[PDB]
Symmetry: D2
Subunit: 178 residues, 4 copies
């Protein structure tokens, strides 16, 4: 029953990265963190200008093509492989495809023990934080705030609308089996 | 009565930068933002290793020497000069010297119309956010949370302990005379 | 004859920022660094989406409107004011307007002692570095490589095409009167 | 004979990251990039303050403990797993242990087709660039410039002392079998 992977899902500006660093500080054993964002940074820059890659609409929409998806797949497998190799992994994701996305993960994970975490946050509030951070495309927060969880099943749910990252971290750590 | 400068004061991780970007988005006229941090980034790197410069204790303490202070002074004058030249300026500061610090500003400002803003936040909560951001020296938040406001007089006060940046932004904008 | 300001001019990716940090390390007295880029970061984000602000064409072109120019002006005056106040200032600029730009500076500077530095670099090579850094809009380097110096007069010229930043730094420092 | 992984080795400031982005732009197929630095960013912050983790001496030295090494191991396996899954991977490493380090990789890689790249650069020059970038601990460049290659065998060697990143990129791409 030892937890091997902690997969978090939430919309942009919902507070995931903040929760991730807190978890890494709180949890006693070292946990590696990776996510759709670190994956993007690891993909070639041109992937962001290629049709079957990832595209950022000016209104904050996000489109994903097969070239991008294909790469992501091998990446996912590698992350699972790290867990298998004995590294405790935290995944900061954004299930744009809702349930479809969670399934995709389930397939790569297999019988590996995973803690599915849901990070919610009022769209309006997320949108406010989006402005405050100033480093995201205005509109992503709102567009993602809800559709991301539709049909997704979690083992734990935190809502950053009125809870600090460190607090949400404590709630999540409590469900982590050593 | 037109506001020329908005000087914010608060401890590390209290939420100032977030409020600043919100203000820049909210306010109709363009406001330039500068602060102790941009000043630091503009000072030579070695200033951070020189005795009369700025020193960061491992426990999160911050010491300021005369070499640093001298530079800061000319900088302050320049910022005031920008206001005088007609640029709307926002200053994100950290009054380590409490009232002493506010006086220092008053001297540079003169009869220029300034909106003194206080950004408060529970030390414990600030410390939590400090961990979540992971890019500050652990301990700064708590050490600064309160001593920074002792003896300081504001025209407006916001407390980020339970208020989003955008909200605090709205409260502050309301006191800005066009 | 003491040098109060060091104004560098060069196209994107020509190597200015690198030379700037070297100068700050080399020069014995503390020099504050500021530039078109720090100014941009200090301007509201929306300035980048407003017509009379600054616009970044997808091919790497850069357009500047009056709203942006107006702000820049007050900023320039403030920087000069810092020099006057006794702070040694380094300005990392990009004379898009060639000679016109240098004149604009001359007007703000007045009789202040300034060291005009020219940072050149082969367009092709600059374009290569542009790719290597991956954090600029492809095409800026080439578009700026030359037009930026047309009609501009320097006291010192360095060419980073075959010279390291630290070397160019040494050449520039040598012309700085204490 | 299709190349699955490109493993680059070089000392800090030798120019690897710059070469990596160029390769990602040059190579026709998408290549994911990862390295000791992205791994560090993915490890908990505290790993940098824990004895068996990674420690940064003030003079630029770097020490690695077993806790850090253990994690790195599972990470290495995961990266190899990504290659196996069909993702083209580029690894930006720093063989502090010289030959010992290359062996460690050979063990994880197995019979996977790998292109071993060596990125050299004169210590003095690397040290100069270290200053110019200003975001590394002074002294790392020099300490690493040479010891890193002792006993290491490459399929290709580039020297950034007098060659631009894009050029070195071209030399390396030429040895990549599709
Ligand atoms: O802005 C970014 N990422 C955010 C999420 O952190 C963006 O909203 C996003 C959402 C989903 C996504 N995906 O699922 O492939 C990619 C980017 C990075 Cl490009 Cl910096
Ligand atoms: O190289 C490109 N495109 C082709 C299709 O025109 C290609 O198959 C591709 C798309 C994205 C990509 N990536 O992320 O590196 C790589 C190759 C464009 Cl990005 Cl210029
Ligand atoms: O960490 C930093 N700054 C914070 C404040 O944002 C630090 O707490 C600090 C506080 C006061 C200060 N001062 O008043 O000179 C300088 C740095 C910068 Cl060095 Cl990145
Ligand atoms: O140059 C240095 N120090 C002397 C005193 O030893 C000097 O007067 C000084 C201190 C800080 C500084 N700065 O911020 O650039 C500049 C010069 C050290 Cl930083 Cl190496
Ligand atoms: O990319 C940027 N700046 C470069 C120069 O460093 C861009 O080429 C540029 C050039 C000139 C300019 N101007 O003169 O107003 C503004 C940006 C910043 Cl937006 Cl990050
Ligand atoms: O606020 C805006 N525009 C008007 C004109 O429609 C305005 O006068 C302005 C433009 C740029 C700007 N800035 O940089 O903050 C401020 C106000 C747009 Cl940026 Cl939404
Ligand atoms: O400074 C850093 N990394 C450089 C290399 O890019 C440092 O020189 C270093 C070298 C070797 C290393 N290792 O082999 O574990 C880790 C960091 C990161 Cl901590 Cl930002
Ligand atoms: O938690 C810590 N240490 C113990 C040993 O005292 C621990 O086993 C450990 C070290 C590094 C680490 N990491 O990278 O997350 C995790 C746990 C210190 Cl970092 Cl406070």
């Amino acid at each position: 029953m030892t937890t091997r992977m902690i997969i978090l899902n939430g919309g942009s500006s919902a507070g995931k990265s903040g929760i991730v660093r807190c978890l890494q500080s709180v949890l006693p054993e070292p946990w590696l963190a990776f996510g759709v964002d670190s994956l993007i940074e690891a993909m070639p820059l041109k992937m962001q200008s290629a049709e079957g890659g990832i595209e950022f609409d000016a209104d904050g929409g996000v489109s994903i093509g097969p070239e991008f998806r294909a790469l992501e797949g091998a990446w996912a497998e590698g992350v699972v492989a790290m867990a298998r190799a004995g590294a405790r992994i935290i995944i900061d994701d954004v299930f744009l495809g809702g349930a479809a996305a969670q399934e995709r993960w389930r397939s790569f994970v297999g019988d590996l023990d995973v803690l599915w975490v849901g990070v919610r946050c009022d769209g309006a509030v997320a949108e406010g934080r989006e402005t405050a951070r100033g480093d995201r495309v205005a509109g992503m927060a709102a567009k993602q705030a809800y559709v991301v969880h539709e049909g997704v099943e979690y083992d734990v749910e935190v809502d950053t609308t009125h809870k600090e990252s460190i607090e949400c971290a404590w709630a999540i750590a409590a469900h982590v089996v050593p």
